């Protein structure tokens, strides 16, 4: 395709902040990638921000420092950013820019793609039709995740959400083994993980843990330490999504993308906007944050005629534990469902501190069902939730009514509360529970009472499951 | 026409170096021909606002000058297809590309250009007869159900110079022509009309007919009106498109135009399933909803301006099908999404934030939207009559009615219906609150309800006061203990319970409750009110003098008749004749009389 | 007079939002009216706002859309906006700009008038004294209205202020009872079709169409015309008041929409804001509108004005109702609690205010003790609300006797004084008799505000 020699300029009409203005450029185009070479020999990349006649502006990625007026080369590429996607990238580790960092070789690209991606036709959407298992009993049993659902995970500063993310990574998978393990051996599942805006301790911890779990043969990893250039923050997600797309729809696999710390994404985007001199929007965040998060989240689902899917589990932190902060508000609007973690539960030394009372789901009704699972799921979930809500409000009642006036059934509700928080929720970092184990523990916890109190379960399944 | 493609602060991108051309017109940019919008003018420099991405566009790029502003194509074959905010036939695009993603600058007409269509001319006017705009001059049968009438656009008149013979013609064919005084002009079956303006009509007329809804609840209490304007809350878990299904199947409307913003392929595929599932025996034969309705939807990740233009193209299509003498219903759902879209548009205009970023002219756009509605006698020789309704789905943030859009819209619509998560969590179906819902059209529909039935108005009034009174006495029965009070109050709450349990609830899956004919609603409500009146007479008579008839006495002396009351719904009117049900109701009333007579 | 021909132009330096900028203009005049001919032959108008050098700026009235630089033509007239006025305009219909709607012909004019009018000299102002009979007890009795007053009516979305306004029009007159009547000019500021039909039908009903000039601007019309329509109607009113010696009543509706349109037009120029983003000078502009009312020495006519505005989200501190409360000298404050109880006409009295009562009433006007009844009734109403708020917490056991008296007074007064009905028109003396009927409930040794004399001569009966 491209065959022309590239240009290079020694023109610098000025510099200001993280930008560098030049001119006398022939037929510039927007979003063109630009290299730079300083007097001391360092090489730095960049992108074109502004274009006006023969004037140009380039935001230098690595940060502007020591750029002379007359001694500075500026080569142009003439193409927008393009990713070298390839199936073989699994088992590797990269930085934000895509340069490998695990002592490995440059990726022998199998195909080149546009970093931005393209919108997917709503006509060719396919509704989800089956669940998955994340390895967490609290999440699978109480709140199903379909193929193609977009469930965020709200957390706050000071909670162990990162440990939960690592646990989800090292145990995510499928439950097709309902019928037979022989037909289950056909596994076509992979995970792509995008650590962004992460401090150094957590980056090392992630790398070590992922390497320890022994399933790195199906994990792609992207790291962007908080040291690296702030603009690389808002380029890491695009690379991750392009890779996930190429794997999903060109290899017919089942990919699970997990994004971390979207608050840092928001902050980096804010800084880019403010450097770009644009007028501020609400709360100092730019107006089109909605559109931007939309174009990031909307790349998933299922495609008619392709055997594959993309599931999204973004994570983010709520400043000041404020549920009406814009980032969680917009994230909730665009996405489907929500999962909480609560300070008090972590403060009860319960791991994972997953607060199911305000945790919802949107596709649970259709993710589960006969065949893809047992026939005894939805009623069990309803009963567990109802029992737990009764138990908690009843503890609130006994707090003042006195334990002496309590009925014996009241003690049964308290027993349910304590056992539910002792066994169902608490699992431990490596106790890989399956869905079937989770439902077994659920039935065991339900066995405390007679079927008469269990008024959310149909009698037909009571005659089968309750007397076990 | 030189693409001085400036650098930008969003997907917007501008150009310059072009001659004089009017604004609010769309131009194509670059070799891939991305659409955009002229905003500002300055000498030979015109700012433009593209919709799609701005990556890769170079300076000097050709800027295709255009002759028309943003406009929708109109003509046969619209029904059943799917469109984006800029009128692209997504099904045809998917078929053409054999691709999953949407390409850029797909420059293909919305409607077919190679499929012929049967055509029946007027057969009453000749070549040379004078005609004016708005007059029907042809007919075409799109499908088994509806015939696409054909009429002149406004602003056109003259002495005809060609009349097509009946036959089969493609889109590009010239079916009409006429010589104005000085010049002439050729017209095809496809008309292009600007989006941001309202078609003319003969005159707007009052609303004097009630909208037909499948469910007697919200159809006998808070009646919507044909040609009306209403709003409904919308949140997950309670039901929003349930109303869409109910109106699309069981209503007297002749077409449904659905508008979507930020939706999933779910609603599209599910209403596609409703097409062969929700089928009607209009001619004694089940027939798909695809032949009637049309859909226009977009997703969040599509360009912003497309999201905004969606609702206007939806209005235009609704008006166009109304002009053909029909009864349109337009569900402009996800209104708060349109609000966020307007905020987005204002985010890149340096406008002053009136309230929470909302531009100043939010109220103007709200009014101009909801205005385009109501009954009209149409402009043209045939002298037909139709109307348009609008159903704006308000979606508050978690139940807070404080956003300027919510309040501004609640003071404009006249019918508002309840929807609360609590009722759906109570297993009470349909989820209608009845205490935050109202209807201001009651004075209008009095004439209609008086002419045809002559009792229904007292019945609904009495029902309303009884219900509010019960909600009032809830506090007193809380105080006393719900085990001791006067007998008259007891019978009042008991009739309230009976109406609540048997009349103000409707199983959407039961064969005899899948639709509720209005005559059956009238009979049910009248017989109930008669029962309560007779019980009140008896209890009061025995309470004043002696031998007080307590609610136990009435339960045991009339309990089988109470089973009859609660079994009045087991009728199955779809097969059982109306006369049979009327006879059953009258016989039950006579049995009621016998039981009360022997009560005292 | 002016025989200078009217220049036309083809210069359009550029467009930016609703503005249009011209260049190479020979001596522009601030605020001169200009016609615009678009490429399609349809017509528009505008008004110059800012002039500097040979450049000028033009606000388009119909909304800017379809303006081409090389083909549009900008004709200038060379004078301020000027309107035709004639007596026979009564009994017609017009749109916002003044063109006829009713299939009639344009107004052959008896004179040209300035749209803005011009201030009246405070020395030659006869203070208003004569009282109007509204019939509604909540006004006649609590917040009486004398001709020349400019009291507004505060409402909220979904409240029946339209019914109140129509009834006020129907039953206007003179308490002191040739046959006098009214000439009513009505202007609409973005009402819906339903409202227009209601008002038009109501005026048709009582045969009063012979003496009503109408000005109608639905939401369909471009928003910029909403700036001009009020001043035009008000000019017509001033003409009929001082050049025909008639008595006139003005009804502007939904000035909230007018404030919104003012915000819209101001945002184009980027002026300094105020509270809730409205222009700072919006206060002075509303003053320019409202004040033009009252009675002037040496004449016989008079201008009464009854603007109507809705309160967004019932927030009374909102700038529009506040600045109205500053300019005008009263308020009504339609309540929604009563509307929820299904009461007619649901008007609060506790925050209503009428500054002209101090001279509207007295001996020889209504009755000797008219003021005293008002004071005492309001005081009992206030203490009754306080007692209800107290009862909401303490419980029935804590109530003393006077709490019971105040609560039964509250209930009886609400069901009697406030409630009138769609067409019941009480005489003023009937209203005072009813007020005394409510006062007699309390023993005489507790009506503190009333003087001892009035209680001696009136209370026992």
Nearest-CA distance A291 → chain B (Å) = 7
Touching subunits of B (3+ CB pairs, under 8 Å) are: A, C
Is C115 in the B-facing interface, judged by CB distances under 8 Å? Answer: no
* CA neighbor of B149 nearest in space, from B164, B170, B159, B134: B134
Is the Cβ–Cβ distance between A420 and A447 less than 8 Å?
no
Nearest-CA distance C3 → chain B (Å) = 34
Tokens (6 digits) for A176: 């097709």
Nearest-CA distance B304 → chain A (Å) = 8
Tokens (6 digits) for B45: 């420099």
The CA–CA distances, whole Å, from C95 to C213, C214, C262 equal 11, 8, 19
A276 among the known binding-site residues?
no
Q: Which residues 12-51 of A are in CB contact (within 8 Å) with B?
A: 27-32, 48-51
Tokens (6 digits) for B239: 């039901």
Chains B, C: CB pairs < 8 Å: 88
Positive or negative, the CA dihedral C112, C117, C121, C122 is positive
Residue in chain C nearest B228 by alpha carbon: C194
Nearest-CA distance A419 → chain B (Å) = 27
Tokens (6 digits) for C273: 């804001």
Tokens (6 digits) for C83: 């309107």
Secondary structure (3-state) at B115:
coil
The C-alpha R_g of chain A, in whole angstroms, comes to: 26
If you write DSSP's letter for every residue of C196-234 in order, what string do you get?
HHHHHHHHHHTTGGGGEEEE---TTS-TTHHHHHHHHHH
Tokens (6 digits) for B137: 């001059």
Is the Cβ–Cβ distance between A195 and A206 less than 8 Å?
yes
The full length of chain B comes to 600
Is B457 in the C-facing interface, judged by CB distances under 8 Å? Answer: no
Q: Which residues 169-188 of A are in CB contact (within 8 Å) with B?
A: none
**C-alpha–C-alpha distance, residues B544 and C20, integer Å:** 82
**C-alpha–C-alpha distance, residues B302 and B262, integer Å:** 9
Residue A339: φ, ψ to 5°: -130, 135
Tokens (6 digits) for C430: 């009937």
Is the Cβ–Cβ distance between C74 and C12 less than 8 Å?
yes
B490 among the known binding-site residues?
no
**C-alpha–C-alpha distance, residues C102 and C92, integer Å:** 7
Q: How was this one solved? A: cryo-EM
Q: Is A367 exposed, middle or buried (0-12, 13-18, 19+ CB in 10 A)?
A: buried
**C-alpha–C-alpha distance, residues A79 and B58, integer Å:** 11
Is C415 in the B-facing interface, judged by CB distances under 8 Å? Answer: no
Cis check for the bond before B225: say yes or no (omega within 30 of 0): no
**C-alpha–C-alpha distance, residues C437 and C439, integer Å:** 6
Is B93 in the A-facing interface, judged by CB distances under 8 Å? Answer: yes
With the CA atoms of A358, A364, A370 and A371 taken in that order, what torsion angle do they form, in degrees rounded to the nearest 10? -120
Is the Cβ–Cβ distance between C36 and C42 less than 8 Å?
no
**C-alpha–C-alpha distance, residues A73 and A9, integer Å:** 6
Touching subunits of C (3+ CB pairs, under 8 Å) are: B
Nearest-CA distance B102 → chain A (Å) = 6
**C-alpha–C-alpha distance, residues B130 and A74, integer Å:** 71
**C-alpha–C-alpha distance, residues B450 and B446, integer Å:** 6
**C-alpha–C-alpha distance, residues A127 and A166, integer Å:** 28
Cβ-Cβ contacts under 8 Å, C261 against chain B: 364
What one-character DSSP code corresponds to residue A149? -
Phi-psi region of B75 (alpha: psi -120 to 50; beta: other; left: phi over 0): left
Residues followed by a break in chain A, C–N over 2.5 Å? none
Is B481 in the C-facing interface, judged by CB distances under 8 Å? Answer: no
Nearest-CA distance C323 → chain B (Å) = 18
**C-alpha–C-alpha distance, residues B319 and B200, integer Å:** 10
Cβ-Cβ contacts under 8 Å, B265 against chain A: 122-127, 301
If you write DSSP's letter for every residue of A322-378 in order, what string do you get?
-TTSHHHHHHHHHSS--B-B-HHHHHTT-SS-B--SS---SSHHHH--BTTB-SSSH
Cβ-nearest to B20 among C13, C65, C69: C69
Chains A, B: CB pairs < 8 Å: 132
Cβ-Cβ contacts under 8 Å, A298 against chain B: 299-301
Is the Cβ–Cβ distance between B208 and B448 less than 8 Å?
yes
Is B40 in the C-facing interface, judged by CB distances under 8 Å? Answer: yes
Report CB contact under 8 Å: C13, B43. Answer: yes
**C-alpha–C-alpha distance, residues B292 and A459, integer Å:** 44
Is B90 in the A-facing interface, judged by CB distances under 8 Å? Answer: yes
Is C103 in the B-facing interface, judged by CB distances under 8 Å? Answer: no
Tokens (6 digits) for B148: 């696409």
Nearest-CA distance B272 → chain C (Å) = 36
User: How many Å is the maximal CA-CA distance in chain B?
Assistant: 101
Cβ-Cβ contacts under 8 Å, B407 against chain C: 157, 312-313
Cβ-Cβ contacts under 8 Å, B69 against chain C: 66
Report CB contact under 8 Å: C197, B206. Answer: yes
The CA–CA distances, whole Å, from C188 to A112, B338, C251, C314 equal 63, 28, 8, 22
* CA neighbor of C73 nearest in space, from C8, C161, C170: C8
Is A456 in the B-facing interface, judged by CB distances under 8 Å? Answer: no
Report CB contact under 8 Å: B102, A57. Answer: no
The CA–CA distances, whole Å, from C346 to C349, C417, C421, C430 equal 10, 11, 10, 20
Is the Cβ–Cβ distance between C94 and C124 less than 8 Å?
no
Residues 6 or more apart whose CB falls under 8 angstroms from that of C436 comprise C373, C458, C459
Report CB contact under 8 Å: A51, B6. Answer: yes
Q: Which of B4, B54, B59, B350 to mutate to test the interface with A (most CBs of A within 10 A)?
A: B59
Resolution (A): 4.4
**C-alpha–C-alpha distance, residues B3 and B57, integer Å:** 9
Residue A458: φ, ψ to 5°: -70, 150
Cβ-nearest to A31 among B56, B91, B340: B56
Tokens (6 digits) for A212: 């320890």
Report CB contact under 8 Å: A48, B56. Answer: no
**C-alpha–C-alpha distance, residues B110 and B106, integer Å:** 11
With the CA atoms of A327, A328, A330 and A332 taken in that order, what torsion angle do they form, in degrees rounded to the nearest 10? 160
Domains parsed from chain C with CATH numbers: 1-461 (3.40.50.12240)
Is C220 in the B-facing interface, judged by CB distances under 8 Å? Answer: yes
Which contiguous run of DSSP H or E holds residue B91? Answer: helix B90-97
**C-alpha–C-alpha distance, residues A200 and A191, integer Å:** 22
Is B360 in the C-facing interface, judged by CB distances under 8 Å? Answer: yes
Is the Cβ–Cβ distance between A59 and A46 less than 8 Å?
yes
Report CB contact under 8 Å: B40, C15. Answer: yes
Nearest-CA distance C339 → chain B (Å) = 13
The C-alpha R_g of chain C, in whole angstroms, comes to: 26
Q: Is A302 exposed, middle or buried (0-12, 13-18, 19+ CB in 10 A)?
A: buried
Q: Which residues 187-206 of A are in CB contact (within 8 Å) with B?
A: none
Number of Cβ within 10 Å of residue A161's Cβ equals 22
Residue in chain A nearest B351 by alpha carbon: A279
B261 among the known binding-site residues?
no
Is B343 in the A-facing interface, judged by CB distances under 8 Å? Answer: yes
**C-alpha–C-alpha distance, residues C324 and A6, integer Å:** 68
Number of Cβ within 10 Å of residue A144's Cβ equals 28
**C-alpha–C-alpha distance, residues B467 and B498, integer Å:** 11
Report CB contact under 8 Å: A28, B59. Answer: yes
Report CB contact under 8 Å: B7, A30. Answer: yes
Cβ-Cβ contacts under 8 Å, B58 against chain A: 27-30
**C-alpha–C-alpha distance, residues A114 and C139, integer Å:** 73
B–C contact: 3+ Cβ pairs < 8 A? yes
């Amino acid at each position: 395709y491209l065959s022309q020699p590239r240009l290079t300029y020694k023109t610098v009409s000025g510099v200001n902040g993280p930008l560098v203005i030049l001119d006398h450029v022939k037929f510039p185009r927007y979003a063109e990638i630009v290299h730079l070479t300083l007097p001391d020999g360092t090489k730095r990349s960049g992108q074109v921000l502004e274009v006006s006649g023969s004037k140009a502006v380039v935001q230098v990625f690595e940060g502007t420092s020591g750029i002379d007026a007359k001694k500075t080369s500026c080569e142009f590429t003439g193409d927008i950013l393009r990713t070298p996607v390839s199936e073989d990238m699994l088992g590797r580790v990269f930085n934000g820019s895509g340069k490998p960092i695990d002592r490995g070789p440059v990726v022998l690209a199998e195909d080149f793609l546009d970093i931005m991606g393209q919108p997917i036709n709503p006509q060719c959407r396919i509704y989800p039709e089956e669940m998955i298992q994340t390895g967490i009993s609290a999440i699978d049993g109480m709140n199903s995740i379909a193929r193609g659902q977009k469930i965020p995970i709200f957390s706050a500063a000071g909670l162990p959400h990162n440990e939960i993310a690592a646990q989800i990574c090292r145990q995510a998978g499928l439950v097709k083994k309902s019928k037979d393990v022989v037909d289950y051996s056909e596994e076509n599942f992979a995970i792509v993980f995008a650590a962004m805006g992460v401090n150094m301790e957590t980056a090392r911890f992630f790398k070590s843990d992922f390497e320890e779990n022994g399933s790195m043969d199906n994990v792609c990893l992207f790291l962007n330490l908080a040291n690296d250039p702030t603009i690389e923050r808002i380029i890491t997600p695009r690379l991750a999504l392009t890779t996930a797309e190429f794997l999903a729809y060109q290899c017919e696999k089942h990919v699970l993308v997990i994004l971390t710390d979207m608050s840092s994404y928001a902050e980096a985007l804010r800084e880019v906007s403010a450097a770009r001199e644009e007028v501020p929007g609400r709360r100092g965040f730019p107006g089109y944050m909605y559109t931007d998060l939309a174009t990031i989240y909307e790349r998933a689902g299922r495609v008619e005629g392709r055997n594959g899917s993309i599931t999204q589990i973004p994570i983010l932190t709520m400043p000041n534990d404020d549920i009406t902060h814009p980032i969680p508000d917009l994230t909730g609007y665009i996405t489907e469902g929500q999962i909480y973690v609560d300070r008090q539960l972590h403060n009860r030394q319960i791991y994972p501190p997953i607060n199911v009372l305000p945790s919802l789901s949107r596709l649970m009704k259709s993710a589960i069902g006969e065949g893809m699972t047992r026939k005894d799921h939805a009623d069990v979930s309803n009963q567990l939730y109802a029992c737990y809500a009764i138990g908690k409000d009843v503890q609130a009642m006994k707090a003042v009514v006195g334990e002496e006036a309590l009925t014996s059934d009241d003690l049964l509700y308290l027993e349910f509360l304590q056992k539910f928080e002792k066994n169902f929720i608490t699992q431990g970092p490596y106790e890989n529970r399956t869905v079937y184990e989770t439902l077994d523990i659920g039935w065991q916890l339900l066995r405390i009472f007679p079927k008469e109190m269990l008024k959310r379960i149909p009698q037909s399944t009571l005659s089968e499951f309750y007397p076990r | 026409t030189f693409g001085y493609v400036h650098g930008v602060s969003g997907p917007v991108v501008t150009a310059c170096d072009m001659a004089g051309a009017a604004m609010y017109e769309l131009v194509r940019v670059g070799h891939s021909e991305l659409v955009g919008e002229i905003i500002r003018l300055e000498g030979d420099m015109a700012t433009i606002q593209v919709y799609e991405e701005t990556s890769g566009v170079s300076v000097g790029d050709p800027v295709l000058r255009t002759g028309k502003p943003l406009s929708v194509e109109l003509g046969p074959g619209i029904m059943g297809a799917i469109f984006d905010g800029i009128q692209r036939p997504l099904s045809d695009i998917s078929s053409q590309t054999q691709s999953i993603y949407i390409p850029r600058g797909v420059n293909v007409s919305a409607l077919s250009r190679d499929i012929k269509w049967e055509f029946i001319p007027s057969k009453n006017l000749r070549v040379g007869s004078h005609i004016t705009g708005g007059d029907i001059y042809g007919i075409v049968n799109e499908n088994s159900l509806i015939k696409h009438k054909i009429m002149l656009p406004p602003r056109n008149r003259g002495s005809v110079t060609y009349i097509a013979p009946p036959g089969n013609y493609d889109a590009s064919d010239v079916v009409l022509e006429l010589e104005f005084e000085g010049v002439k002009e050729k017209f095809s079956m496809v008309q292009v009309w600007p989006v941001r303006q309202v078609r003319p009509v003969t005159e707007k007329l009052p609303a004097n007919h009630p909208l037909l809804t499948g469910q007697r609840v919200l159809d006998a209490l808070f009646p919507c009106v044909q040609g009306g304007t209403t709003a409904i809350p919308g949140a997950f878990g309670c039901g929003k498109t349930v109303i869409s299904q109910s109106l699309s199947k069981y209503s007297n409307s002749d077409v449904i135009i659905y508008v979507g913003c930020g939706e999933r392929g779910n609603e599209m595929s599910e209403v596609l399933r409703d097409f062969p599932e929700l089928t009607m025996e209009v001619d004694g034969k089940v027939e798909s909803i695809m032949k009637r309705t049309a859909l226009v939807a977009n997703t969040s990740n599509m360009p912003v301006a497309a999201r905004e233009a969606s609702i206007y193209t939806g209005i235009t299509l609704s008006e166009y099908f109304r002009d053909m003498g029909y009864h349109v219903s337009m569900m402009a759902d996800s209104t708060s999404r349109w609000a966020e879209a307007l905020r987005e548009i204002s985010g890149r205009l340096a406008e002053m934030p009136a309230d929470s970023g909302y531009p100043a002219y939010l109220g103007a756009r709200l009014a101009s939207f909801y205005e385009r509605a109501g009954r009209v006698k149409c402009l043209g020789n045939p002298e037909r009559e139709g109307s348009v309704s609008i159903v704006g789905a308000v979606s508050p943030p978690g139940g807070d009615f404080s956003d300027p859009v919510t309040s501004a819209t609640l003071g404009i619509v006249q019918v508002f219906w309840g929807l609360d998560k609590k009722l759906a969590q109570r297993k009470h179906f349909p989820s209608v609150n009845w205490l935050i819902s109202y209807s201001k059209y009651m004075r209008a529909l009095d004439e209609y309800y008086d002419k045809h039935f002559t009792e229904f108005v007292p019945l609904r009034t009495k029902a309303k006061e009884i219900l509010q009174e019960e909600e009032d006495l809830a506090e007193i029965v809380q105080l006393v203990g719900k085990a001791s009070l006067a007998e008259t109050d007891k019978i009042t709450l008991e009739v309230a319970k009976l109406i609540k349990d048997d009349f103000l609830q409707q199983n959407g899956y039961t064969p005899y409750d899948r639709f509720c004919p209005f005559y059956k609603t009238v009979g049910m409500l009248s017989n109930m009110i008669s029962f309560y009146d007779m019980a009140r007479r008896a209890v009061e008579t025995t309470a004043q003098s002696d031998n007080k008839i307590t609610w136990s006495i009435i339960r045991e002396h009339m309990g089988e008749i109470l089973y009859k009351l609660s079994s009045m719904k087991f009728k199955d009117p779809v097969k059982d004749g109306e006369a049979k049900i009327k006879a059953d109701y009258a016989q039950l009333l006579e049995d009621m009389q016998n039981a009360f007579r022997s009560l005292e």
